[model samples]
Target: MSISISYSTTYSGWTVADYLADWSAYFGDVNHRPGQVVDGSNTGGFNPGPFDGSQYALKSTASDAAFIAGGDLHYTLFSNPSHTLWGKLDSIALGDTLTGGASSGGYALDSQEVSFSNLGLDSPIAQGRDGTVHKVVYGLMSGDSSALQGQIDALLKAVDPSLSINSTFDQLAAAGVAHATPAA
Candidate 1:
């Protein structure tokens, strides 16, 4: 059996940090702590709590560039066009808790768990079920957009010799995973 793959210049509202978090979920390996809590109500003054599940909560603050900028734990793969990837370097503890809302005031939104089967084939990263392959695609997304189409074509062909390459954004759109093309 063979697998067909494609690429996207747009990310359908997914951020670099989100991709990084998903990467850790699948691979279980990273540089800094995953799933750290940031207090949206007091984002600047908040300190990450100990590995207690209840203390952490999900909030919009977790997605802010300001929150991630101060910590060594977070890093960016690319940001020029803002369509690249951002990620944490460490693994999240199994005991860490993830919940949504503002009750705790602590935003614990980074690196939530991911089930590849649940993502279906519509997600760009989901096309590469393997974590390693996903990393390669992630790298490409952060690189030059002009080269993305040709590179993904080569990658898809390499992954499946019998596969026919579809080098258009429409194919990605048909899969329900396309967004506006990023500026070159």
Candidate 2:
């Protein structure tokens, strides 16, 4: 029905513990570890239906088969060690290509990575090991594919006029979005 957009920044000084702690608080569960299967029913309103742990890895190649196998809407993106870019797709059959010609499977969605110039931002909130600013956007809609794509386009445009509504992460990467990988 409507789309939502918000912004948050992570400083470089924070350790992996700090980042995971924040996510744990946000999800209301301490089990918010990487590669963990998110129980959509309890993730506030981030419900994307049923998913397995393998379907949410930090690397796309690790979860591609499972992602393509499901008919549910899946989020996708590209990320490195500190930044990430995110986007959603109605289905993986549309495409699951990453920036460097890799298969994200389903792990690209809702993961971590960082980028600064992609989102039209000026500077990091603070200087640290992970001084990255992240944009969060999502839409809740119910309709046919046409309507859903329309809503997605409008929602992304509202977040930034330069974003593309395609099913791949190219546009998001081109826009300067990046994601972080799980801590070592």
Candidate 3:
């Protein structure tokens, strides 16, 4: 048996600029009250991700189904807490526009909302600290598992040329190719 794995994320309807902006606001800083990002100048603190308030235009074409624009958020962890958090964003989807908090019918109401995604965080209350939950954090992002085995194989090959795509996407998808009891 070989040890190989692949994971991918697709972000849509947004841009790197806006994503960082929203992230900064969500994780405010010493310069701004209620910030979680330690000041870069602080002891051993790393500078925050960069952004200057620019965003990609909202877009969708017939070739796209989600109607929300998209991009690839790709990487293999090797996982951990903080590193995974930022690194995981390689798989995300951002919406073109922001929306309001209240849901209308099944979707959010048409007015007064921020862009929303499946990746936003929610509430947690520490024993000695107050916690917050935003009704709207706006954006779109999701993991894509389409070509699972092939993707993993590529990643493995990238790391070690000796390895190959042992289980390709097609092979994995075909019935009885994997997960079968070894012939006795």
Estimate every model's Cα lDDT from 0 to 1. 0.28, 0.27, 0.24
lDDT preference between candidates 1 and 3, better one:
1
lDDT of 3 by residue, 30-149 (tens): 221124325533111111212101111111121111212112111112322111212111112222323321122111112211222222222332211111111111121112222222
State every prediction's TM-score relative to the real structure.
0.19, 0.22, 0.18
lDDT of model 3 at residue 15?
30
User: What TM-score should be assigned to candidate 3?
Assistant: 0.18
**TM-score-best of 1 and 2:** 2
Off-target runs (Cα >4 Å) in candidate 3 are: 1-59, 67-154, 158-167, 170-184
User: What are the RMSD figures for all models against the true structure?
Assistant: 14.5, 17.9, 16.9
What is residue 5's positional error in candidate 3, in angstroms?
A: 7.3
Tell me the spans in candidate 2 whose CA falls farther than 4 Å from its real position: 1-143, 176-184
Off by over 4 Å in 1: 1-170, 175-184
